[PDB]
Design a binder for this molecule. Structure first.
Ligand SMILES: CC(=O)N[C@@H]1[C@@H](O)[C@H](O[C@@H]2O[C@H](CO)[C@H](O)[C@H](O)[C@H]2O)[C@@H](CO)O[C@@H]1O
Ligand SMILES: CC(=O)N[C@@H]1[C@@H](O)[C@H](O[C@@H]2O[C@H](CO)[C@H](O)[C@H](O)[C@H]2O)[C@@H](CO)O[C@H]1O
Ligand SMILES: O=c1ccn([C@@H]2O[C@H](COP(=O)(O)OP(=O)(O)O)[C@@H](O)[C@H]2O)c(=O)[nH]1
Ligand SMILES: O=c1ccn([C@@H]2O[C@H](COP(=O)(O)OP(=O)(O)O)[C@@H](O)[C@H]2O)c(=O)[nH]1
Ligand SMILES: [Mn+2]
Ligand SMILES: [Mn+2]
Lengths: 243, 245
């Protein structure tokens, strides 16, 4: 009966990738009924990602799709591939409860976050730290427990002024709205979340989590680029040793 | 199953809670682990105290403020690591045959679960490769056919006593207790020689124990976290300062 949480994680090859996937997997290993949908931004599945997923024992699906020359946001085509995979895997009126969460590989997630999104009926929302040039963004909730706006500074007029890591969607809505995908073509920066949510739910139907959006359970952390200046042009370390 | 005493210096800054949260999520998987969190502050902060209590991990919350004056060449977290060393020596009798290992783990690095099992059996001092240090993809101890460390594969001062990062070694607790005068140096050592300053008083190259498949695998990464952009907070502030992040 416990709903399955489908975590959609776009990822790409770069120095810190294995470290990012490692601490993220260490977090996900604590969550029951979790399906990790990892979509690599590559022409084919890489052995690094394949072996890491295999060794964790986690329930996962490993997909891949390469981003076009112009590299629109980041991770878009990968999240869209995952949405299509879900629709091809689960029938529109499926009865198996599920929740979909788009979790980037560098963010920091608390275990409480997953407990909060698991009961999502339509779309749930919560505060996100380190987004929109603020300590955190948070949906505005009235005393009745309804979402009536957003507490942000960056373009507060977007239909859904919230970051990718700030909401989850019941799988049923994703299957019913079979044509709803993240916009990549004519897309204003910061409107990717709205491009999808607008087609799935209305403001008044959002389900505020994290004690009526007063607590921060997820952080939009960024990882610094490692300095590899000492490798030189010919390289110093063994290129066959995986990092 | 030997207890692993993880020494983690930490300080108040925007990403602190996040760093401790994802680190706790990793540590929660490790059995017989004692987390020695040492805050760089005048007193234990409610944020850290609450987080440690909520994790369910076995921990000891200590604190020592690095003089404001000092921060204005003293390696980050030095005084905090030394406070933990002193605490271990004042808590555990020099002789008791208590199986344990000490590991200095900074709050922003990335650790694999396999790393802890590799260091848990340490008899003296164990060493292993560390990614993203010394301007390289990784630094790795060099081992000979006899199974002994005979040098270090690095570009930055590979000829120093111990050319290895803080996250690349662990010390048997008994050894820490025996060498009661061994602490990280505060001043007098060249940049990048603090790890050597301590290790040289603890062991010789020949007594090192190579881990991580004879130092051929990377099980720990010296990752660093970017500073969050808070420009939209303005001068007077936008978000509620009472809301913990
Ligand atoms: C580009 C470069 O060579 N950088 C080096 C630093 O790596 C070095 O910092 C030390 O590096 C060692 C590596 O084993 C440890 O990580 C140690 O903790 C670091 O202090 C500094 C030393 O002053 O020199 C250059 O910056
Ligand atoms: C300092 C500042 O205002 N920066 C903004 C970015 O925040 C913004 O990025 C978008 O931010 C929203 C926040 O809810 C969300 O994280 C989106 O995913 C993200 O794209 C960017 C838009 O291109 O403009 C900057 O100026
Ligand atoms: O070419 C790229 C750049 C990013 N990503 C992934 O898509 C998400 C976008 O995150 P990143 O740019 O950190 O996002 P930011 O922090 O800039 O919002 C993360 O899971 C990345 O691993 C990707 O697949 N391909
Ligand atoms: O004023 C400070 C700066 C850092 N630290 C801690 O000491 C370690 C040093 O790390 P940081 O500078 O990242 O180290 P670097 O990546 O520069 O080696 C980390 O556990 C920090 O939380 C601290 O206690 N006080
Ligand atoms: Mn990111
Ligand atoms: Mn660090």
């Amino acid at each position: 009966a416990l709903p399955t949480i489908h975590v959609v994680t776009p990822t790409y090859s770069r120095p810190v990738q294995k470290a990012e996937l490692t601490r993220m997997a260490n977090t996900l290993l604590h969550v029951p009924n979790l399906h990790w949908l990892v979509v690599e931004d590559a022409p084919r599945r890489t052995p690094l990602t394949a072996r890491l997923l295999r060794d964790t024992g986690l329930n996962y699906t490993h997909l891949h799709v390469e981003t076009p020359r112009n590299y629109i946001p980041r991770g878009t085509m990968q999240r869209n591939l995952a949405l299509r995979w879900l629709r091809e895997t689960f029938p529109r009126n499926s009865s198996q409860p599920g929740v979909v969460y788009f979790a980037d590989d560098d963010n920091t997630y608390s275990l409480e976050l997953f407990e909060e999104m698991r009961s999502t009926r339509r779309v749930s929302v919560w505060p996100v730290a380190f987004v929109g040039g603020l300590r955190y963004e948070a949906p505005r909730v009235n005393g009745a427990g309804k979402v009536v706006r957003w507490k942000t500074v960056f373009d507060p007029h977007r239909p859904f002024a919230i970051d990718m890591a700030g909401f989850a969607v019941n799988l049923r809505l994703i299957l019913q709205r079979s044509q709803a995908y993240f916009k990549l073509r004519g897309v204003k920066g910061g409107y990717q979340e709205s491009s999808l949510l607008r087609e799935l739910v209305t403001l008044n139907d959002l389900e505020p989590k994290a004690a009526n959006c007063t607590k921060i359970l997820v952080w939009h952390t960024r990882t610094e680029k490692p300095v590899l200046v000492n490798e030189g042009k010919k390289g110093f370390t063994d290129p066959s040793v995986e990092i």
